[PDB]
Amino acid sequence: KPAVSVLTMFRYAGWLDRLYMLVGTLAAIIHGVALPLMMLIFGDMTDSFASVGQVSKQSTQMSEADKRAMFAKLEEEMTTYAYYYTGIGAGVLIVAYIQVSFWCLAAGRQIHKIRQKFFHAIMNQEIGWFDVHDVGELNTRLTDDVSKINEGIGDKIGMFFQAMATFFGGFIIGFTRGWKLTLVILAISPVLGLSAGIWAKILSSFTDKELHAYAKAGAVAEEVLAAIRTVIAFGGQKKELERYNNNLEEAKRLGIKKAITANISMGAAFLLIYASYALAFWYGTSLVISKEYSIGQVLTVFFSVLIGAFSVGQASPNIEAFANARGAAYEVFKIIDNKPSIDSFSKSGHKPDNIQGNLEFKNIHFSYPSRKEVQILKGLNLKVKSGQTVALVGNSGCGKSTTVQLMQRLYDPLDGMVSIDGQDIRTINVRYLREIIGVVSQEPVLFATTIAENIRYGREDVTMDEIEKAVKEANAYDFIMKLPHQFDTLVGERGAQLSGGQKQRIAIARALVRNPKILLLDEATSALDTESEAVVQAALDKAREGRTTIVIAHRLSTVRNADVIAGFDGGVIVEQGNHDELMREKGIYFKLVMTQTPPASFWRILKLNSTEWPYFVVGIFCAIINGGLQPAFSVIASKVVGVFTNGGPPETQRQNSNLFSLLFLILGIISFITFFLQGFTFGKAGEILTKRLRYMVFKSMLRQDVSWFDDPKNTTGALTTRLANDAAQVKGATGSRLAVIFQNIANLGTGIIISLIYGWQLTLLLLAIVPIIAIAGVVEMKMLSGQALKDKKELEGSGKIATEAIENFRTVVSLTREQKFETMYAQSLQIPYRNAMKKAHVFGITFSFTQAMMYFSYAAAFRFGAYLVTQQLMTFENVLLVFSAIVFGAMAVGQVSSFAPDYAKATVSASHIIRIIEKTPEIDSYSTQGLKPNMLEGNVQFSGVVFNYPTRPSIPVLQGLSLEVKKGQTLALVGSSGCGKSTVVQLLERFYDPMAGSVFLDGKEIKQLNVQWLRAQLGIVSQEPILFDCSIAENIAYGDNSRVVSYEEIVRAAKEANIHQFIDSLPDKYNTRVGDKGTQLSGGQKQRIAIARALVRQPHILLLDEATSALDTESEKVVQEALDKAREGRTCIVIAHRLSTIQNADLIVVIQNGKVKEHGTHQQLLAQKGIYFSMVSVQAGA
Ligand SMILES: Brc1ccc(Oc2c(Br)cc(Br)cc2Br)c(Br)c1
Ligand SMILES: Brc1ccc(Oc2c(Br)cc(Br)cc2Br)c(Br)c1
């Protein structure tokens, strides 16, 4: 929404840049004007063949006499027009270079200036300007927004003025040569803009319906794949597939309805567009029979108008490129034009010599850019004598850290002044002030250069002697010399990461070369290892003594030797004096001392599509007919102008043009009929395999065991996304792109045959010219992408050192050296600059070549069409036909290179979708094999079970576990932590087979038992019961599948679960909907329902997995009262964390490191004193 003045955007264009654009926009206009003139000459060539075409057939008497006056007229005329043609081709060759080169020259020259001034403005902002802004967005604003500016002031402006030249020059020639046909062509324009307006209303309203259609099926998949362990446990895998298949059945009915309507729309709009043209051209014929226009003049206007009409659309993208570049330049120039109050690039203010370093802080009130929300300093008074070292202590707020911030004048105070020596700090030059102040911060940062270079960031003029003395004076010389490469080592985020105490020592050496008169140490010892702290502290004590120093830290070891100590309380200075005096005061300082002491040939995806042997042959044969039918429109138009040029006696012409225009409209309706078929057939054939694919995938997905659904690769969202994309992508490959790719090869094929058999060597010439200009058009794009990738790699190195400069900004500005990063960034940009200069010459050469190759191709098209061919007996009506048929059939092949990614993006989406079906699990619930025992009573035998989870085979959960529980008794399961309690329930459900050992139920190993039948005797109840969106009667009846559960049967379970108070209180009762879609209820009711579906199964084994986990107050007392009634009649395994409710259990077992540690009845484990005794004691007391 915000934008820029047009002149201010070009403020960096001067002298040559203003001339480059002037000459560039000039030749661009010359480039555009060249095309409608080329069509104007085409009218004069028609009248030359038309006057001879009328007189040659007018004879029917003399023959050798027509070999004289006619051929001489053709000789002088065709040579004149071919001479003019070769001139136009040389014209477009020059202006197209001038157009693109000059504009790319002005663009490259300016963007180089924009980028430097921008980065200069970034480093010029004061710190308070950075505290309110995001540096990451700013650097991306540097590389992205400047790119948008470059796209707007580049050769696009030349293309824009070239297009308006075609538009103006087209309608000028259109108006002058005849004001009638223009107004007739404009009259059909609202119809063409209205038919394409129905498309923007049909696409935008139907693309939501399909995204609404599958969203109902994808909602089923989401709540299923999220509750996968519940449907697996209850075996509803046939139902949840059936529901998904029922929603797929509706999505395909809405998909074929959209295929019917969208193809009716495309054919009808196409028929309205082509009938509009033919009416405007049949109207053109009606004005030649009246001798009002020439047969060649109708072409001259009908083309210059339509060329200039579409020239509007070809200019619209360049308008958006210029406007986006304007608005992109707003926030950029806003930074450049913004002037700071602090500067630091300014050359102003005093530079005192013989600075003695007497600092004082006078009534300083300050607040960080958070402003009126927080005021961290409410008044202040502090002096530090020259030579002295004052230390600042404080409980919190870190107002201690603010004084170091103000001392470098990173901010100016709200009220009050900070005075170095006697002068106010604002009277001294900012850069010189930061140069007389050395800073060592808590987190030290080293830039990605050598040690000597990071030390060289203290002062640019320095020799290895001073570097050596500096690191030796910080006792940092001993440890770097052992490091290889000596001073030439590397540091940074990338490469040679060092100890914290060593990086700080280099920072101390970096600040030591500064030879500052003032020293600021802000928690440099804090957040550092204790051993290396003394090594750095020795350097800090050796760094002072020659300077006045303010030091801030939470280490009260470094504070004793300070001449004065200062305490803060709420931004107010409270206590000050020597260490001993502050202890006698017994105040804030004394208080803190005591406190701290694979693309491949995939045919089988088409073999599954072979379910429909027809519907394809219908579409293909219908598409090939539609392919063979398009050039016949060019054949009609070739003979509408052909018989009109080859007319002779004019009486028969008027009756013939009516016949051709009628046949055209009969060919158009027969084109509509065949287009709708090839669309509907492919559409329906694509929507049905979408159901087959999503059905077989969702079927195979429910086949995999819990081992697969635990994969971090496969989550519910990533599965629903893999489910939708892969099915829609394969539909596109077999869909419209294939019906079109066969319609087009049939379009060129039926066109090349007609053209070849008509003109001998005429077509053979064009078949030598067209492929070359097509290949030359391709190689230009390859060089375009190569230069684009190269320039992206080169400015990346510049923005990389710009990223380093601005992300570590608060450090560099503290060291000044901003001019250093400016020079570094400038040297980095110099390579893309000289690159951008060559880019203009290359871009201009390639564009001019492809334009000239199109215009010279046109001259050879007629100089050969006339002369050698027309001095023979071959005719002009065919040369028009060959031109239209060949060039249109070639532009139809241009759609093959556009639908190419739709094939690869589908084959990759097909690559995954063929494997996701074929993958077979270790435990497949679909296998009908298994024993299915007849004996009812149920035991459970865990024996020597060692189990690790397949996702994390690191820490084992079960190591030699062994349990046994008889029928009808409760097996309590206590554990220190982890799923060692829960893994038992998962292995009994046989979500996994154990690594070693085995687990039995009736004495049979479940590994050889039937998987589905096994889970059919289990009443699983988990922590958070997930209930699908349906009737609570269905969530209850979900406990027993393969049979419809009676209402009184699902009532019995609801009576059993004590949920009947809700089920009768509801208005709908058992038919109420639950799942946070129709109704919402608390977890206590959700659990009771899950208990109901558990015992609707009438299992012989309950499985209660921390059922009272998320519950509270009386809700626990009523749910536990229901669970306690559910057991005592079945085999039961309860791992509930309420050991008070576990006391009345037939056997309590304590799990330890996967092994069973203690076991026995409650009082038995209470008689023993150990883990279980400690478990019951800890939470009964707490
Ligand atoms: Br000769 C000649 C060629 C194309 C003509 O109009 C067009 C044009 Br222009 C493009 C297509 Br596709 C089909 C037809 Br019909 C006319 Br009118 C005359
Ligand atoms: Br230069 C140039 C001129 C006309 C071109 O298209 C044609 C062609 Br090809 C034939 C006829 Br008749 C009219 C037009 Br307009 C092309 Br492509 C390039």
Author numbering: 30 to 626, 689 to 1273
Text lifted from the article:
The multidrug transporter P-glycoprotein (Pgp)/ABCB1/MDR1 plays an important role in multidrug resistance (MDR) and detoxification owing to its ability to efflux an unusually large and chemically diverse set of substrates. P-glycoprotein (Pgp), a member of the ATP-binding cassette (ABC) superfamily, is one of the most promiscuous drug transporters in nature and is capable of binding and expelling a very large number of substrates from the cell. The structures highlight a high concentration of aromatic residues in the transmembrane α-helices that form the DBP, many of which are directly engaged in contacts with ligands. The binding mode of the environmental pollutant BDE-100 in the DBP of Pgp was also previously captured by XRC and it was shown to be a potent inhibitor of verapamil-stimulated ATPase activity of the transporter.
The site 1 residues present in the Y303A and Y306A mutants but not the F728A mutant were Tyr303 or Tyr306 or Gln721, Ser725, Phe728 and Val731 owing to a rotation of the ligand to form a site that we designate site 1A in the F728A mutant. Phe724 and Phe728 (both on TM7) appear to be important for maintaining the integrity of the canonical BDE-100 site 1, since the mutation of either residue resulted in ligand shifts away from this site. The F728A mutation resulted in an ∼75° rotation of the ligand around TM7 at the pivot point of Ala728 to site 1A that is closer to the pseudosymmetric axis and maintains van der Waals contact between the ligand and TM7 [Figs. 1(d) and Fig. 5]. Despite the rotation of the ligand in the F728A mutant structure, there was sufficient space in the DBP to accommodate the binding of another ligand molecule in site 2. Ligands in sites 1A, 2 and 3 generally exhibited greater disorder compared with those in site 1, as shown by higher B factors in refinement and some smearing of the anomalous electron density. We conclude that Phe974 undergoes an induced fit-like disorder-to-order transition to support the binding of BDE-100 in sites 2 and 3, and this residue is therefore important for polyspecific recognition of the BDE-100 ligand when the primary binding site (site 1) is challenged by mutagenesis. All structures were determined in the 3.98–4.17 Å resolution range and adopted the same inward-facing conformation as wild-type Pgp.
